[PDB]
Amino acid sequence: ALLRILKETEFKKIKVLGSGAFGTVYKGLWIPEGEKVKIPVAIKELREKEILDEAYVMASVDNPHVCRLLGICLTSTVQLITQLMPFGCLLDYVREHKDNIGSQYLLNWCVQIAKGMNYLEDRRLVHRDLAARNVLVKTPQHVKITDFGLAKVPIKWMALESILHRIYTHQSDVWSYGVTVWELMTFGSKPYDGIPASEISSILEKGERLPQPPICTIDVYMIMRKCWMIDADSRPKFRELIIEFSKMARDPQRYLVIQGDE
Ligand SMILES: *CCC(=O)Nc1cc(Nc2nccc(-c3cn(C)c4ccccc34)n2)c(OC)cc1N(C)CCN(C)C
């Protein structure tokens, strides 16, 4: 019902925003026939009615912090159309604006991402790929999780049970959220940098986690370490994360120590 079936005519690709294994994501423009408007969109052209039932689930996602699937073009390839996020991804945003981001901005992004995920959990959906590269910036104070439904490997964002047993729950998403928060607090550092992906399980089983980012007080880093608990049920719930980070965002200077914030 809310899945607009497009014809090649109403949309045209411009630049390539990203690519690899699943297909290419392009910057584009959507000028539907019946209308007289040009809407900037992002087009994920996948490789060759197989995944059309997943697209109807993606089209039904109705939350301000989750990207909704606008339309689809079913030809020899599947082409997925969505609103273009003009500021790009949050990972590139925190790297580019590294020296101008205050504690209120980071804590609010934490609330927004937790909210979008808690919406997916309420809808009985699992993301399977939450990362700062997959959080997009609509405006600097409005972020949305993208790539929902593309999952049907990002080892350094995977929970232990996902690497070992291929288990994907809402609790494995919480682990990936903990890593996404680490990416925001370190201004886009790569998790377990240098460290090969084949030994991440060894490191996790050993007891090793991502280090405390300098700007985090103990209170913020404790939320992150709870997301990375071996026991999935001991991790915080997405609705507790909204509560923890919303309270922190009320007095942001107590929880994050930013040079050039107060
Ligand atoms: C983290 C890289 C990234 O996403 N960068 C960009 C994103 C833009 N917008 C946008 N809007 C909606 C959806 C997507 C999107 C979705 N998926 C799964 C993507 C994968 C790769 C790339 C984009 C994806 N993207 C955007 O629009 C203005 C620009 C960028 N980048 C590519 C700008 C240049 N960058 C190298 C700094």
Curated annotation (Swiss-Prot):
Effect of L150R: Found in a lung cancer sample; somatic mutation; constitutively activated enzyme with strongly increased kinase activity; more sensitive to gefitinib than wild-type
Summary of subunit composition and partner proteins: Binding of the ligand triggers homo- and/or heterodimerization of the receptor triggering its autophosphorylation. Heterodimer with ERBB2. Forms a complex with CCDC88A/GIV (via SH2-like regions) and GNAI3 which leads to enhanced EGFR signaling and triggering of cell migration; binding to CCDC88A requires autophosphorylation of the EGFR C-terminal region, and ligand stimulation is required for recruitment of GNAI3 to the complex. Interacts with ERRFI1; inhibits dimerization of the kinase domain and autophosphorylation. Part of a complex with ERBB2 and either PIK3C2A or PIK3C2B.
Effect upon mutating V126L: Found in a lung cancer sample
Gene symbol of the encoding locus: EGFR
Disease listed for this protein: Lung cancer: A common malignancy affecting tissues of the lung. The most common form of lung cancer is non-small cell lung cancer (NSCLC) that can be divided into 3 major histologic subtypes: squamous cell carcinoma, adenocarcinoma, and large cell lung cancer. NSCLC is often diagnosed at an advanced stage and has a poor prognosis.
Binding site for ATP: L17, G18, S19, G20, A21, F22, G23, T24, V25, K44, T82, Q83, D147
Top-level lineage group: Eukaryota
Effect of E8K: Found in a lung cancer sample
Effect recorded for R254A: Reduced phosphorylation
UniProt organism field: Homo sapiens (Human)
Name of the protein described by the UniProt record: Epidermal growth factor receptor
Residues forming coiled coils: none
Cellular location(s): Cell membrane; Endoplasmic reticulum membrane; Golgi apparatus membrane; Nucleus membrane
